[PDB]
């Protein structure tokens, strides 16, 4: 009979939000605060059970990064066989959320109902109770809201065809059925509002009965909020209110104005009040995925150069850490928000930095007869390269990786575009190699490659060019590159192909957007190329209306279907209005004619000589895609091919043969290892082997294998009976750095490879 508060996520390079569970005596768990992306992937990484969790209370305003990783916990959770599931939050735009997610999130079997709570609604459970609070960023009282009844009535229903109790049919893709494409209803009456949480714990039982502490759960976004928090919270009764928990967005500063928010919570009626403060320029700056950081520096000691070191600095807050204790150590960088020392009247031993492992645990109590039992412990996870690197790769003992070469000289040096060959020819980052599920050890799928252009007078440019992007691509990329890297990233990013409509592949594509705003925004002329299916082009249209409108005057998306090699051309399905969603289809004669002027208006821009897409042999509006590339204006014949398999089974006849033909380099899919054969045919990927033959067959001058499903890191198989046509090969893994020209010297590598990781085999096989 106690309950202990354990912080899941703090903010972080990969993680962006925190998400807290609460966890029961006898293991009844709820979640709290932001499912952002990786915090699905950070949950197996810890070995935490998600056994009996089926309350999931949504906190803040609901952007991208703060649900992005709940499709993906969704379906994992489902996979997982849970029952039942609950999400929670205090605005009805939480349905129009999982309604833009129709056609790439379907699972049977899970009863997942949406529970939209009024301003002060609670929630009573056998365990917990919760009440809400609507703070509204500029007014004070919710009066219409944002849908009409009937609104809100159709939104239900599709987040209800999207979670059935039994399976439709067996070959049912949610790409190719009609009676999804649902005109969405308008966001005119949208409000900006942060939900929060009070949470209190039932009392525990002649005797007298003793009672639990209560906890403040709060969502501040930026500084426009704390204005409507003030006003929401002066007569706020803080009697039995044992700790508050404020969840600090990037954009809000910590100085005096917030303080004197803080301030209303400094007592409660039987002493004082515990604060902890989750916030970015507060929360250190932690390694949230050691899996990935682990393999990625064995990886790095045989061929460095061709990885980042994951960063772990980040500015903090002067002001915080010195009006307080454990003030900053000189080297590490620091913020000053404002001039005089901050202006307080809360105790140093009285408020606390929200971190991973500094949990809260709360324990009952005698009303007035003791004080309120509430015990804050754990210390922040501690991180040495050099303790690591000694202990898990020097043992290894490979040619020259001593821990300066590999980590200590290199640990201030950018590996992407330094070098002089590396400006003037091509650079692959794959940002993640997986298939399906982010893995312990390689994320979901991501390719960015530059393509330089050198210019008349002989100054060279890059053009990114961003394959596919999972959950939390922009995190992958946050953590190897310093802040002034990511910049020049996006400024020079100016297309997005996605290959078809698994949630593996486009996930991240909206936090993608929004950075790559943060840096094109103020350029007038700056726009960028999306071609995707027209599916995800309703997705992105239908989200950015909620999120960020401004972004879709730049958006010039294409459809991947206009671009296929074939005279045919599939006519896409017209839109049903909201009216008529109630109980064929007619079809769109004009989504048949090629979009020449935006497709001839592509190539002038980013220099494309010729762009074509041949269907995936795996979903419905799947796609595989080659692009030509002329690389200067003095030069007819200096043309560089790419090509990219969806996860097409191996189509050597309208890919290998036909589009995809004599390209400089393929980019393929190699989800299966050759001994599931039966099992990738199934699934419709390609193993290793169906791989190489369609390099083989399509002429490819080099290649390049990703989307792996792998139990644990390892190289994969080589057939010794198949020939590699190809001068030069390479086999992605997450954080990986390729010049074109030099992609072949991992061969070399090759046999020490598979060693480095009989730790992580050893350790897998606990199971086996
Ligand atoms: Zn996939
Ligand atoms: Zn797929």
Not at 492 to 505: E, G, Q, R, V
Not at 710 to 726: F, G
């Amino acid at each position: 009979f106690m309950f202990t508060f354990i912080p899941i996520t703090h903010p972080t390079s990969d993680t962006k939000h925190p998400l807290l569970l609460v966890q029961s005596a006898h293991g009844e768990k709820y979640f709290f605060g932001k499912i952002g992306e990786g915090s699905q992937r950070s949950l197996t990484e810890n070995k935490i059970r998600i056994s009996k969790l089926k309350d999931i209370f949504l906190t803040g305003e609901l952007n991208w990064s703060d649900i992005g990783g709940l499709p993906g916990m969704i379906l994992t959770i489902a996979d997982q066989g849970k029952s039942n599931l609950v999400l929670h939050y205090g605005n009805d735009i939480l349905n129009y959320i999982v309604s833009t997610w129709r056609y790439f999130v379907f699972r049977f079997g899970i009863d997942l109902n949406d529970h939209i709570m009024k301003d002060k609604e609670v929630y009573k459970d056998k365990i917990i109770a919760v009440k809400s609070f609507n703070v509204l960023k500029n007014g004070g009282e919710d009066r219409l809201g944002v849908f009409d009844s009937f609104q809100k009535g159709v939104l239900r229903s599709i987040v209800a065809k999207m979670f059935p109790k039994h399976a439709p049919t067996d070959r049912y893709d949610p790409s190719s059925d009609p009676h999804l494409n649902v005109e969405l209803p308008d966001l005119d009456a949208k409000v900006e509002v942060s939900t929060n949480y009070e949470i209190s714990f039932s009392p525990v039982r002649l005797e007298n009965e003793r009672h639990f502490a209560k906890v403040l759960i709060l969502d501040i976004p930026d500084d426009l909020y704390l204005n409507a928090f003030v006003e929401k919270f002066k007569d706020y009764d803080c009697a039995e209110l044992g700790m508050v928990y404020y969840f600090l967005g990037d954009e809000v500063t910590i100085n005096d104005n917030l303080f004197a928010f803080i301030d209303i919570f400094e007592k409660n009626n039987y002493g004082k009040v515990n604060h902890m403060i989750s916030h970015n320029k507060i929360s250190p700056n932690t390694i949230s995925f050691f899996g990935s950081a682990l393999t990625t520096l064995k990886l790095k000691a045989l061929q460095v150069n061709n990885y980042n070191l994951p960063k772990t600095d980040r500015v903090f807050s002067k002001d915080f850490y010195d009006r307080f204790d454990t003030p900053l150590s000189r080297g590490t960088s620091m913020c000053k928000s404002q001039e005089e020392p901050l202006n307080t009247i809360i105790e140093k031993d009285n408020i606390h930095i929200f971190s991973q492992n500094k949990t809260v645990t709360f324990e009952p109590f005698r009303m007035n007869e003791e004080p309120m039992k509430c015990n804050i412990n754990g210390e922040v996870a501690d991180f040495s390269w050099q303790e690591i690197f000694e202990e898990h790769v020097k043992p290894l003992e490979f040619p020259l990786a001593d821990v300066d070469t590999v980590i200590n000289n290199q640990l201030h040096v950018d590996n992407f575009n330094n070098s002089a060959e590396k400006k003037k020819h091509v650079e692959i980052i794959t940002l993640g190699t997986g298939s399906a599920l982010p893995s312990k050890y390689r994320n979901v799928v991501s390719t960015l490659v530059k393509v330089p252009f050198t210019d008349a007078d002989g100054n060279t440019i890059n053009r990114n060019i961003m394959l596919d992007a999972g959950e939390n691509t922009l995190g992958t990329i946050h953590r190897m590159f310093s802040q002034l890297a990511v910049k020049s990233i996006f400024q020079d990013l100016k297309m997005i192909y996605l290959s078809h409509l698994h949630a593996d592949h486009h996930l991240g594509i909206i936090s993608v957007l929004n950075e790559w705003y943060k840096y094109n925004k103020d350029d007038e002329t700056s726009y960028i190329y999306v071609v995707t299916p027209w599916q995800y082009h309703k997705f992105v249209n239908e989200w950015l209306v909620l999120e960020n409108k401004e972004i879709l005057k730049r958006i010039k998306y294409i459809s991947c279907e206009h671009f296929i090699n074939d005279s045919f051309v599939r006519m896409q399905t017209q839109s049903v209005p909201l009216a008529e969603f109630n109980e064929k289809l007619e079809l769109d004669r004009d989504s048949s004619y090629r979009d020449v002027d935006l497709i001839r208006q592509m190539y002038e821009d980013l220099s494309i000589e010729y762009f074509q897409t041949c269907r995936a042999i795996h979903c419905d509006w799947a796609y595989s895609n080659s692009i030509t590339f002329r690389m200067d204006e003095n030069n007819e014949h200096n043309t560089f091919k790419v090509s990219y398999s969806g996860d097409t089974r191996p189509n050597i006849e309208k890919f290998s043969l036909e589009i995809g033909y004599n390209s400089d380099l393929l980019i393929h899919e190699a989800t299966l290892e050759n001994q599931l054969l039966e099992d990738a045919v199934k699934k419709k990927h390609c193993t290793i082997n169906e791989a190489i033959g369609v390099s083989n067959k399509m002429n490819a001058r080099k290649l390049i294998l990703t989307h792996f499903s792998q139990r644990y890191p390892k190289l994969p198989q080589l057939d010794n009976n198949i020939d590699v046509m190809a001068r030069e090969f390479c086999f992605a893994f997450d954080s990986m750095i390729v010049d074109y020209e030099k992609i072949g010297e991992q061969q070399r590598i090759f046999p020490l490879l598979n060693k480095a990781f009989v730790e992580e085999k050893e350790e897998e096989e606990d199971v086996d």
